Amino acid sequence: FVTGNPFIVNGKIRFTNLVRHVEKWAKVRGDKLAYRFLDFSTERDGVARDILWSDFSARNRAVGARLQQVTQPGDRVAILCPQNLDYLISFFGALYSGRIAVPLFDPAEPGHVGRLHAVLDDCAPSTILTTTDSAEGVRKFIRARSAKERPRVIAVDAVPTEVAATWQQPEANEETVAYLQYTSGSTRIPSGVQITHLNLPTNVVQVLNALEGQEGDRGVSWLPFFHDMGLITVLLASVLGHSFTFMTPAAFVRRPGRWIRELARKPGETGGTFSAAPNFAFEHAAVRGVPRDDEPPLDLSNVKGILNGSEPVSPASMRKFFEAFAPYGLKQTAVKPSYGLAEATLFVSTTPMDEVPTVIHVDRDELNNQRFVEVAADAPNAVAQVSAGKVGVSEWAVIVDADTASELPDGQIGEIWLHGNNLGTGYWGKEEESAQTFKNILKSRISESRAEGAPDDALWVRTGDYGTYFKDHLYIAGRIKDLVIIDGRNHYPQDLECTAQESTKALRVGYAAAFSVPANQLPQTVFDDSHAGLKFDPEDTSEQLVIVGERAAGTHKLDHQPIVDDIRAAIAVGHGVTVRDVLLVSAGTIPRTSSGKIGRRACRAAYLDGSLRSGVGSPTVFATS
Ligand SMILES: Nc1ncnc2c1ncn2[C@@H]1O[C@H](COS(=O)(=O)NC(=O)CCCCCCCCCCOc2ccccc2)[C@@H](O)[C@H]1O
Ligand SMILES: [Cl-]
Ligand SMILES: [Cl-]
């Protein structure tokens, strides 16, 4: 699978069904450690829970068989389990049964129980997989829903291993849906991306090829298995030939040094380590994860690549991360900005293995007008842009003017459209939205197209992201739906947030949200302020800028103006827009998505409801102070 590659013939992927492969892999390395769960739920210093490939293989076959009895073909099997070893057994066990898996989370964890109801409504699974300790909690949750199709709850650790003897190899085609990856799609109703048996292995090869993963290397992770980056990482790490070590996201947030520690060289280890994380985590680890004087020596010279993706990369957070860990051997080539999305299984691009991150600066006015014009770092009105690198093999990413379905030249910002075998096939039960998102014809190409190699009649998937190529690197400008359009002009919310943050110490880094709202709904307090601009008018529906930013840690007083004036002035000058309401709230209050990204839509929804000014929560595993 990996050197130390027969699936890449003449620069193209070739090599299906994972169950088949997982089983061979399991028997060959039986009695070797497959997974190690570092459990920090009871002991702060942690407890190691291990499972060998043979045991893992056996458990998957037991669960698969139990499912093959209590479910019908076509049924969905949802996993409502905390992050631990039974989660993997539940997920793999579901794949082993041949039914469509739906990896989710334990209703007993905080943050998004509301999403869980929506997903269950959408895919109506006949069976829920969980652990014995979470079972009562899961049954309570399920009982509270409609009696009609009330699904069976199965505790996987209670299923005897010998049941595996009645397991029958499921038969699967390459186009068969293996599982559903739920994402908060175009509407309130979540979308379940159909990931097939061909999508998985293709994207694994795409990733391992880009990282030059070799036998002897190993993966480490704290990412949630209910998110694409966390789940796919399990599979990537599993094929490196060394055990995969993981922890829960909450354990990372509480003490990020636990992750840093697992990334370190083990005694006598010659291979390298890989991991992945969202931007905010580099900031957190840089500040909270440096080892004290007491701790045993820490060596990070073995770290090959920590992929940084899922949200815009802050050059300052990366800088602070490199600087905090450089003394321990962390190479400048070890942090790798990358791009991906659920619809592509996971991975689309990453920085080439041998190079450091590419960070450039572009003129703001040109950027907002959909063009990359490079400018010096200290140039006024400059916007930092971090490259997402080069597109994976046997995969294409083109920049398109959606209106006419035409490719755009380099430097021009358009929507990013993708084509490749790693691209999902649709959204569960959504025929029309699936057609609109996944079955698009690229009508016009520029000569020397980025579609070179794709068939003329190749189908393209619309990502919903704006982006461009610049000096052969793919840049992710931002998410189309998150744009702040005011007075007929676009603004990237992360750009406005950066400016707000940079103007005043009263805001904590990475916790700001910029969104537009019709002048109708903004509070009365805004009109009673000389620093406002507009005045009372119930007819006016024009979009107006609002900025919400968590108060820097240790904030106990309210001295709004001096901070707000700096923010409004900083944004007026550099963006040509007047911030109307600057709302600063309790540390750890701004809404976070389930993977820990800032929830802008949710911050806008709660701003209007008055649900945000007030709030001693809402608990999330990502909360800190
Ligand atoms: N670099 C970026 N900059 C700005 N925005 C980015 C972004 N990446 C994603 N996004 C934004 O997030 C959206 C997608 O969101 S999502 O559906 O929730 N999915 C996501 O966010 C998924 C992002 C995935 C990024 C690539 C990560 C590859 C990690 C491989 C590890 O390798 C290993 C590890 C261990 C052992 C061996 C190998 C995208 O549509 C875009 O708007
Ligand atoms: Cl047993
Ligand atoms: Cl080794």
Side-chain angles (χ1 to χ4, degrees), residues 183 207 211 219 227-229 233 236-237 240 274 276 307 310-312 338-342 346 465 476 479 597:
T183 58
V207 173
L211 300 181
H227 181 248
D228 60 357
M229 207 165 49
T233 288
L236 294 160
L240 296 173
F274 292 107
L307 286 68
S310 80
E311 52 178 21
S338 313
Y339 167 70
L341 67 172
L346 184 67
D465 292 323
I476 314 305
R479 199 169 57 163
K597 311 181 180 194

PDB file of all heavy atoms in Angstrom, residues 183 207 211 219 227-229 233 236-237 240 274 276 307 310-312 338-342 346 465 476 479 597, ligand 1:
ATOM      1  N   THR A 183     -23.244  16.758   7.257  1.00  0.00           N
ATOM      2  CA  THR A 183     -22.703  18.117   7.295  1.00  0.00           C
ATOM      3  C   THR A 183     -23.884  19.092   7.274  1.00  0.00           C
ATOM      4  O   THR A 183     -24.933  18.793   6.698  1.00  0.00           O
ATOM      5  CB  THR A 183     -21.797  18.428   6.083  1.00  0.00           C
ATOM      6  OG1 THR A 183     -22.527  18.255   4.856  1.00  0.00           O
ATOM      7  CG2 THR A 183     -20.599  17.517   6.077  1.00  0.00           C
ATOM      8  N   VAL A 207      -4.233  10.899  -0.166  1.00  0.00           N
ATOM      9  CA  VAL A 207      -3.551  11.467   0.990  1.00  0.00           C
ATOM     10  C   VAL A 207      -2.147  10.899   1.191  1.00  0.00           C
ATOM     11  O   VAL A 207      -1.185  11.657   1.257  1.00  0.00           O
ATOM     12  CB  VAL A 207      -4.366  11.292   2.276  1.00  0.00           C
ATOM     13  CG1 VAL A 207      -3.563  11.729   3.496  1.00  0.00           C
ATOM     14  CG2 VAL A 207      -5.671  12.069   2.177  1.00  0.00           C
ATOM     15  N   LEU A 211       1.528  12.843   1.179  1.00  0.00           N
ATOM     16  CA  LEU A 211       2.360  12.906   2.384  1.00  0.00           C
ATOM     17  C   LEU A 211       3.598  12.025   2.314  1.00  0.00           C
ATOM     18  O   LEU A 211       4.463  12.125   3.155  1.00  0.00           O
ATOM     19  CB  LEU A 211       1.551  12.499   3.605  1.00  0.00           C
ATOM     20  CG  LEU A 211       0.334  13.394   3.866  1.00  0.00           C
ATOM     21  CD1 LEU A 211      -0.448  12.973   5.100  1.00  0.00           C
ATOM     22  CD2 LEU A 211       0.784  14.832   4.005  1.00  0.00           C
ATOM     23  N   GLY A 219       0.162   7.556  12.881  1.00  0.00           N
ATOM     24  CA  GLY A 219      -0.796   8.652  13.043  1.00  0.00           C
ATOM     25  C   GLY A 219      -1.200   8.868  14.497  1.00  0.00           C
ATOM     26  O   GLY A 219      -1.238   7.925  15.285  1.00  0.00           O
ATOM     27  N   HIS A 227     -16.736  13.780  12.628  1.00  0.00           N
ATOM     28  CA  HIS A 227     -16.411  14.775  11.620  1.00  0.00           C
ATOM     29  C   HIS A 227     -15.490  14.106  10.598  1.00  0.00           C
ATOM     30  O   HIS A 227     -14.683  13.226  10.945  1.00  0.00           O
ATOM     31  CB  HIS A 227     -15.768  15.978  12.278  1.00  0.00           C
ATOM     32  CG  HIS A 227     -15.425  17.073  11.326  1.00  0.00           C
ATOM     33  ND1 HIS A 227     -14.121  17.410  11.024  1.00  0.00           N
ATOM     34  CD2 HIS A 227     -16.211  17.900  10.598  1.00  0.00           C
ATOM     35  CE1 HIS A 227     -14.119  18.418  10.174  1.00  0.00           C
ATOM     36  NE2 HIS A 227     -15.373  18.726   9.892  1.00  0.00           N
ATOM     37  N   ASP A 228     -15.598  14.510   9.342  1.00  0.00           N
ATOM     38  CA  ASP A 228     -14.817  13.858   8.286  1.00  0.00           C
ATOM     39  C   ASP A 228     -13.306  13.797   8.556  1.00  0.00           C
ATOM     40  O   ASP A 228     -12.691  12.774   8.315  1.00  0.00           O
ATOM     41  CB  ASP A 228     -15.108  14.455   6.896  1.00  0.00           C
ATOM     42  CG  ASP A 228     -14.801  15.950   6.797  1.00  0.00           C
ATOM     43  OD1 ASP A 228     -14.415  16.565   7.826  1.00  0.00           O
ATOM     44  OD2 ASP A 228     -14.953  16.510   5.668  1.00  0.00           O
ATOM     45  N   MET A 229     -12.724  14.880   9.055  1.00  0.00           N
ATOM     46  CA  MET A 229     -11.273  14.935   9.313  1.00  0.00           C
ATOM     47  C   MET A 229     -10.865  13.936  10.388  1.00  0.00           C
ATOM     48  O   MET A 229      -9.796  13.342  10.307  1.00  0.00           O
ATOM     49  CB  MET A 229     -10.836  16.383   9.657  1.00  0.00           C
ATOM     50  CG  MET A 229      -9.373  16.602   9.272  1.00  0.00           C
ATOM     51  SD  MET A 229      -8.803  18.491   9.227  1.00  0.00           S
ATOM     52  CE  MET A 229      -9.494  19.063  10.952  1.00  0.00           C
ATOM     53  N   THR A 233      -9.050  10.185   9.230  1.00  0.00           N
ATOM     54  CA  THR A 233      -7.752  10.062   9.841  1.00  0.00           C
ATOM     55  C   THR A 233      -7.540   8.699  10.440  1.00  0.00           C
ATOM     56  O   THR A 233      -6.408   8.225  10.487  1.00  0.00           O
ATOM     57  CB  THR A 233      -7.539  11.136  10.932  1.00  0.00           C
ATOM     58  OG1 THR A 233      -7.366  12.408  10.296  1.00  0.00           O
ATOM     59  CG2 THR A 233      -6.282  10.840  11.726  1.00  0.00           C
ATOM     60  N   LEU A 236      -6.527   6.519   7.521  1.00  0.00           N
ATOM     61  CA  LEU A 236      -5.192   6.880   7.025  1.00  0.00           C
ATOM     62  C   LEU A 236      -4.130   6.287   7.929  1.00  0.00           C
ATOM     63  O   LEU A 236      -3.266   5.536   7.481  1.00  0.00           O
ATOM     64  CB  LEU A 236      -5.030   8.401   6.942  1.00  0.00           C
ATOM     65  CG  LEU A 236      -5.935   9.072   5.908  1.00  0.00           C
ATOM     66  CD1 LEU A 236      -6.091  10.559   6.197  1.00  0.00           C
ATOM     67  CD2 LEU A 236      -5.418   8.812   4.492  1.00  0.00           C
ATOM     68  N   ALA A 237      -4.222   6.597   9.216  1.00  0.00           N
ATOM     69  CA  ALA A 237      -3.276   6.095  10.196  1.00  0.00           C
ATOM     70  C   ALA A 237      -3.240   4.571  10.248  1.00  0.00           C
ATOM     71  O   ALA A 237      -2.178   3.991  10.438  1.00  0.00           O
ATOM     72  CB  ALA A 237      -3.619   6.642  11.568  1.00  0.00           C
ATOM     73  N   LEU A 240      -0.692   2.716   7.819  1.00  0.00           N
ATOM     74  CA  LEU A 240       0.752   3.024   7.915  1.00  0.00           C
ATOM     75  C   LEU A 240       1.583   1.863   8.490  1.00  0.00           C
ATOM     76  O   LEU A 240       2.831   1.882   8.427  1.00  0.00           O
ATOM     77  CB  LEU A 240       0.996   4.294   8.740  1.00  0.00           C
ATOM     78  CG  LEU A 240       0.455   5.609   8.185  1.00  0.00           C
ATOM     79  CD1 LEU A 240       0.642   6.725   9.196  1.00  0.00           C
ATOM     80  CD2 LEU A 240       1.122   5.979   6.881  1.00  0.00           C
ATOM     81  N   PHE A 274       2.266  11.714  11.838  1.00  0.00           N
ATOM     82  CA  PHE A 274       1.364  12.560  11.112  1.00  0.00           C
ATOM     83  C   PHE A 274       0.160  12.802  11.998  1.00  0.00           C
ATOM     84  O   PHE A 274      -0.178  11.989  12.840  1.00  0.00           O
ATOM     85  CB  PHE A 274       0.866  11.899   9.817  1.00  0.00           C
ATOM     86  CG  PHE A 274       1.929  11.710   8.773  1.00  0.00           C
ATOM     87  CD1 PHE A 274       2.434  10.466   8.495  1.00  0.00           C
ATOM     88  CD2 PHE A 274       2.368  12.787   8.028  1.00  0.00           C
ATOM     89  CE1 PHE A 274       3.394  10.294   7.507  1.00  0.00           C
ATOM     90  CE2 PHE A 274       3.319  12.634   7.057  1.00  0.00           C
ATOM     91  CZ  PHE A 274       3.838  11.384   6.791  1.00  0.00           C
ATOM     92  N   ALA A 276      -3.481  15.851  12.126  1.00  0.00           N
ATOM     93  CA  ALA A 276      -4.239  16.893  11.444  1.00  0.00           C
ATOM     94  C   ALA A 276      -4.989  17.693  12.503  1.00  0.00           C
ATOM     95  O   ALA A 276      -5.323  17.155  13.556  1.00  0.00           O
ATOM     96  CB  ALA A 276      -5.222  16.257  10.497  1.00  0.00           C
ATOM     97  N   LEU A 307      -1.308  18.357   9.386  1.00  0.00           N
ATOM     98  CA  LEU A 307      -2.111  19.067   8.404  1.00  0.00           C
ATOM     99  C   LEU A 307      -2.975  20.067   9.116  1.00  0.00           C
ATOM    100  O   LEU A 307      -3.525  19.798  10.179  1.00  0.00           O
ATOM    101  CB  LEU A 307      -2.878  18.099   7.511  1.00  0.00           C
ATOM    102  CG  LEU A 307      -1.863  17.466   6.524  1.00  0.00           C
ATOM    103  CD1 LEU A 307      -0.876  16.558   7.238  1.00  0.00           C
ATOM    104  CD2 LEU A 307      -2.536  16.721   5.389  1.00  0.00           C
ATOM    105  N   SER A 310      -9.536  22.803   7.510  1.00  0.00           N
ATOM    106  CA  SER A 310     -10.967  22.818   7.897  1.00  0.00           C
ATOM    107  C   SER A 310     -11.479  24.267   8.065  1.00  0.00           C
ATOM    108  O   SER A 310     -12.700  24.512   8.024  1.00  0.00           O
ATOM    109  CB  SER A 310     -11.275  22.002   9.166  1.00  0.00           C
ATOM    110  OG  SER A 310     -10.940  22.723  10.340  1.00  0.00           O
ATOM    111  N   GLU A 311     -10.556  25.215   8.224  1.00  0.00           N
ATOM    112  CA  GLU A 311     -10.870  26.639   8.370  1.00  0.00           C
ATOM    113  C   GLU A 311      -9.687  27.500   7.911  1.00  0.00           C
ATOM    114  O   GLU A 311      -8.588  26.987   7.714  1.00  0.00           O
ATOM    115  CB  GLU A 311     -11.271  26.978   9.833  1.00  0.00           C
ATOM    116  CG  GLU A 311     -10.297  26.524  10.902  1.00  0.00           C
ATOM    117  CD  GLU A 311     -10.695  26.913  12.345  1.00  0.00           C
ATOM    118  OE1 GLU A 311     -11.886  27.193  12.634  1.00  0.00           O
ATOM    119  OE2 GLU A 311      -9.789  26.924  13.209  1.00  0.00           O
ATOM    120  N   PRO A 312      -9.910  28.812   7.701  1.00  0.00           N
ATOM    121  CA  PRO A 312      -8.788  29.632   7.253  1.00  0.00           C
ATOM    122  C   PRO A 312      -7.602  29.571   8.193  1.00  0.00           C
ATOM    123  O   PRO A 312      -7.765  29.618   9.401  1.00  0.00           O
ATOM    124  CB  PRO A 312      -9.389  31.050   7.190  1.00  0.00           C
ATOM    125  CG  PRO A 312     -10.839  30.819   6.887  1.00  0.00           C
ATOM    126  CD  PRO A 312     -11.192  29.533   7.595  1.00  0.00           C
ATOM    127  N   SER A 338      -3.885  22.787   4.361  1.00  0.00           N
ATOM    128  CA  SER A 338      -4.552  21.859   3.491  1.00  0.00           C
ATOM    129  C   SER A 338      -6.016  22.202   3.381  1.00  0.00           C
ATOM    130  O   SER A 338      -6.599  22.840   4.265  1.00  0.00           O
ATOM    131  CB  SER A 338      -4.475  20.465   4.100  1.00  0.00           C
ATOM    132  OG  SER A 338      -3.164  20.148   4.538  1.00  0.00           O
ATOM    133  N   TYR A 339      -6.629  21.702   2.327  1.00  0.00           N
ATOM    134  CA  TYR A 339      -8.021  21.956   2.059  1.00  0.00           C
ATOM    135  C   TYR A 339      -8.748  20.684   1.749  1.00  0.00           C
ATOM    136  O   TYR A 339      -8.195  19.763   1.148  1.00  0.00           O
ATOM    137  CB  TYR A 339      -8.124  22.874   0.864  1.00  0.00           C
ATOM    138  CG  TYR A 339      -9.502  23.014   0.259  1.00  0.00           C
ATOM    139  CD1 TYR A 339     -10.514  23.677   0.936  1.00  0.00           C
ATOM    140  CD2 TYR A 339      -9.769  22.528  -1.019  1.00  0.00           C
ATOM    141  CE1 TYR A 339     -11.766  23.826   0.369  1.00  0.00           C
ATOM    142  CE2 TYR A 339     -11.010  22.682  -1.595  1.00  0.00           C
ATOM    143  CZ  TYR A 339     -12.009  23.334  -0.905  1.00  0.00           C
ATOM    144  OH  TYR A 339     -13.251  23.493  -1.478  1.00  0.00           O
ATOM    145  N   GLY A 340     -10.008  20.658   2.156  1.00  0.00           N
ATOM    146  CA  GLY A 340     -10.880  19.538   1.886  1.00  0.00           C
ATOM    147  C   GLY A 340     -12.287  19.829   2.325  1.00  0.00           C
ATOM    148  O   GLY A 340     -12.579  20.906   2.849  1.00  0.00           O
ATOM    149  N   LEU A 341     -13.165  18.865   2.111  1.00  0.00           N
ATOM    150  CA  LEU A 341     -14.555  18.996   2.514  1.00  0.00           C
ATOM    151  C   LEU A 341     -15.205  17.614   2.436  1.00  0.00           C
ATOM    152  O   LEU A 341     -14.726  16.704   1.743  1.00  0.00           O
ATOM    153  CB  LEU A 341     -15.325  20.025   1.646  1.00  0.00           C
ATOM    154  CG  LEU A 341     -15.582  19.739   0.165  1.00  0.00           C
ATOM    155  CD1 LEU A 341     -16.522  20.787  -0.435  1.00  0.00           C
ATOM    156  CD2 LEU A 341     -14.302  19.668  -0.618  1.00  0.00           C
ATOM    157  N   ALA A 342     -16.314  17.483   3.133  1.00  0.00           N
ATOM    158  CA  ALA A 342     -17.015  16.220   3.224  1.00  0.00           C
ATOM    159  C   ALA A 342     -17.351  15.599   1.886  1.00  0.00           C
ATOM    160  O   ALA A 342     -17.294  14.380   1.743  1.00  0.00           O
ATOM    161  CB  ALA A 342     -18.276  16.412   4.028  1.00  0.00           C
ATOM    162  N   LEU A 346     -12.565  13.611   2.062  1.00  0.00           N
ATOM    163  CA  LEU A 346     -11.814  14.466   2.961  1.00  0.00           C
ATOM    164  C   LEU A 346     -10.838  15.401   2.270  1.00  0.00           C
ATOM    165  O   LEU A 346     -10.943  16.624   2.353  1.00  0.00           O
ATOM    166  CB  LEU A 346     -11.007  13.674   3.985  1.00  0.00           C
ATOM    167  CG  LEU A 346     -10.309  14.608   4.993  1.00  0.00           C
ATOM    168  CD1 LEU A 346     -11.329  15.308   5.870  1.00  0.00           C
ATOM    169  CD2 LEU A 346      -9.291  13.893   5.852  1.00  0.00           C
ATOM    170  N   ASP A 465     -17.223  27.045  -2.113  1.00  0.00           N
ATOM    171  CA  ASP A 465     -16.066  27.839  -1.720  1.00  0.00           C
ATOM    172  C   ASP A 465     -15.541  28.730  -2.860  1.00  0.00           C
ATOM    173  O   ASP A 465     -15.543  28.321  -4.025  1.00  0.00           O
ATOM    174  CB  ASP A 465     -14.924  26.917  -1.322  1.00  0.00           C
ATOM    175  CG  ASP A 465     -15.190  26.155  -0.049  1.00  0.00           C
ATOM    176  OD1 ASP A 465     -15.802  26.736   0.876  1.00  0.00           O
ATOM    177  OD2 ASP A 465     -14.756  24.977   0.036  1.00  0.00           O
ATOM    178  N   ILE A 476      -7.853  29.214  -0.880  1.00  0.00           N
ATOM    179  CA  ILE A 476      -9.255  29.172  -0.515  1.00  0.00           C
ATOM    180  C   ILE A 476      -9.587  30.568   0.009  1.00  0.00           C
ATOM    181  O   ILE A 476      -9.147  30.959   1.089  1.00  0.00           O
ATOM    182  CB  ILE A 476      -9.541  28.119   0.574  1.00  0.00           C
ATOM    183  CG1 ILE A 476      -8.846  26.793   0.252  1.00  0.00           C
ATOM    184  CG2 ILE A 476     -11.040  27.921   0.746  1.00  0.00           C
ATOM    185  CD1 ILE A 476      -9.194  26.225  -1.111  1.00  0.00           C
ATOM    186  N   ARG A 479     -15.896  30.888   2.225  1.00  0.00           N
ATOM    187  CA  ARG A 479     -17.118  30.192   1.907  1.00  0.00           C
ATOM    188  C   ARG A 479     -18.132  31.219   1.369  1.00  0.00           C
ATOM    189  O   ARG A 479     -18.396  32.235   2.011  1.00  0.00           O
ATOM    190  CB  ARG A 479     -17.596  29.421   3.159  1.00  0.00           C
ATOM    191  CG  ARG A 479     -18.586  28.312   2.854  1.00  0.00           C
ATOM    192  CD  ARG A 479     -18.857  27.381   4.024  1.00  0.00           C
ATOM    193  NE  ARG A 479     -19.351  28.090   5.204  1.00  0.00           N
ATOM    194  CZ  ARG A 479     -19.969  27.516   6.244  1.00  0.00           C
ATOM    195  NH1 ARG A 479     -20.227  26.202   6.266  1.00  0.00           N
ATOM    196  NH2 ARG A 479     -20.364  28.274   7.258  1.00  0.00           N
ATOM    197  N   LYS A 597     -15.341  24.987  14.728  1.00  0.00           N
ATOM    198  CA  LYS A 597     -15.198  26.177  13.901  1.00  0.00           C
ATOM    199  C   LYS A 597     -16.119  27.236  14.496  1.00  0.00           C
ATOM    200  O   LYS A 597     -17.010  26.903  15.269  1.00  0.00           O
ATOM    201  CB  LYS A 597     -15.634  25.912  12.467  1.00  0.00           C
ATOM    202  CG  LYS A 597     -15.032  24.662  11.862  1.00  0.00           C
ATOM    203  CD  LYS A 597     -15.490  24.449  10.425  1.00  0.00           C
ATOM    204  CE  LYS A 597     -14.849  23.177   9.879  1.00  0.00           C
ATOM    205  NZ  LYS A 597     -14.953  23.053   8.386  1.00  0.00           N
TER     206      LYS A 597
HETATM  207  N1  LIG B   1      -7.495  25.438   4.312  1.00  0.00           N
HETATM  208  C1  LIG B   1      -8.729  25.951   4.395  1.00  0.00           C
HETATM  209  N2  LIG B   1      -8.905  27.287   4.394  1.00  0.00           N
HETATM  210  C2  LIG B   1     -10.143  27.798   4.468  1.00  0.00           C
HETATM  211  N3  LIG B   1     -11.239  27.026   4.553  1.00  0.00           N
HETATM  212  C3  LIG B   1     -11.154  25.678   4.555  1.00  0.00           C
HETATM  213  C4  LIG B   1      -9.924  25.074   4.484  1.00  0.00           C
HETATM  214  N4  LIG B   1     -10.126  23.749   4.518  1.00  0.00           N
HETATM  215  C5  LIG B   1     -11.465  23.549   4.602  1.00  0.00           C
HETATM  216  N5  LIG B   1     -12.079  24.731   4.625  1.00  0.00           N
HETATM  217  C6  LIG B   1     -13.523  24.998   4.709  1.00  0.00           C
HETATM  218  O1  LIG B   1     -14.247  23.907   5.284  1.00  0.00           O
HETATM  219  C7  LIG B   1     -15.195  23.401   4.381  1.00  0.00           C
HETATM  220  C8  LIG B   1     -15.337  21.897   4.507  1.00  0.00           C
HETATM  221  O2  LIG B   1     -15.807  21.568   5.808  1.00  0.00           O
HETATM  222  S1  LIG B   1     -16.059  20.125   6.210  1.00  0.00           S
HETATM  223  O3  LIG B   1     -17.076  19.485   5.370  1.00  0.00           O
HETATM  224  O4  LIG B   1     -16.503  20.177   7.597  1.00  0.00           O
HETATM  225  N6  LIG B   1     -14.806  19.265   6.074  1.00  0.00           N
HETATM  226  C9  LIG B   1     -13.613  19.704   6.482  1.00  0.00           C
HETATM  227  O5  LIG B   1     -13.471  20.726   7.120  1.00  0.00           O
HETATM  228  C10 LIG B   1     -12.433  18.819   6.146  1.00  0.00           C
HETATM  229  C11 LIG B   1     -11.143  19.590   5.889  1.00  0.00           C
HETATM  230  C12 LIG B   1     -10.027  18.597   5.542  1.00  0.00           C
HETATM  231  C13 LIG B   1      -8.697  19.274   5.248  1.00  0.00           C
HETATM  232  C14 LIG B   1      -7.599  18.295   4.839  1.00  0.00           C
HETATM  233  C15 LIG B   1      -7.137  17.452   6.002  1.00  0.00           C
HETATM  234  C16 LIG B   1      -6.355  16.226   5.559  1.00  0.00           C
HETATM  235  C17 LIG B   1      -5.908  15.453   6.807  1.00  0.00           C
HETATM  236  C18 LIG B   1      -5.248  14.149   6.398  1.00  0.00           C
HETATM  237  C19 LIG B   1      -4.504  13.525   7.550  1.00  0.00           C
HETATM  238  O6  LIG B   1      -3.433  12.597   7.221  1.00  0.00           O
HETATM  239  C20 LIG B   1      -2.987  11.604   8.041  1.00  0.00           C
HETATM  240  C21 LIG B   1      -3.205  11.623   9.419  1.00  0.00           C
HETATM  241  C22 LIG B   1      -2.741  10.577  10.196  1.00  0.00           C
HETATM  242  C23 LIG B   1      -2.051   9.519   9.608  1.00  0.00           C
HETATM  243  C24 LIG B   1      -1.827   9.495   8.230  1.00  0.00           C
HETATM  244  C25 LIG B   1      -2.302  10.546   7.448  1.00  0.00           C
HETATM  245  C26 LIG B   1     -14.678  23.824   3.020  1.00  0.00           C
HETATM  246  O7  LIG B   1     -15.728  23.861   2.081  1.00  0.00           O
HETATM  247  C27 LIG B   1     -14.069  25.175   3.302  1.00  0.00           C
HETATM  248  O8  LIG B   1     -15.062  26.206   3.286  1.00  0.00           O
END
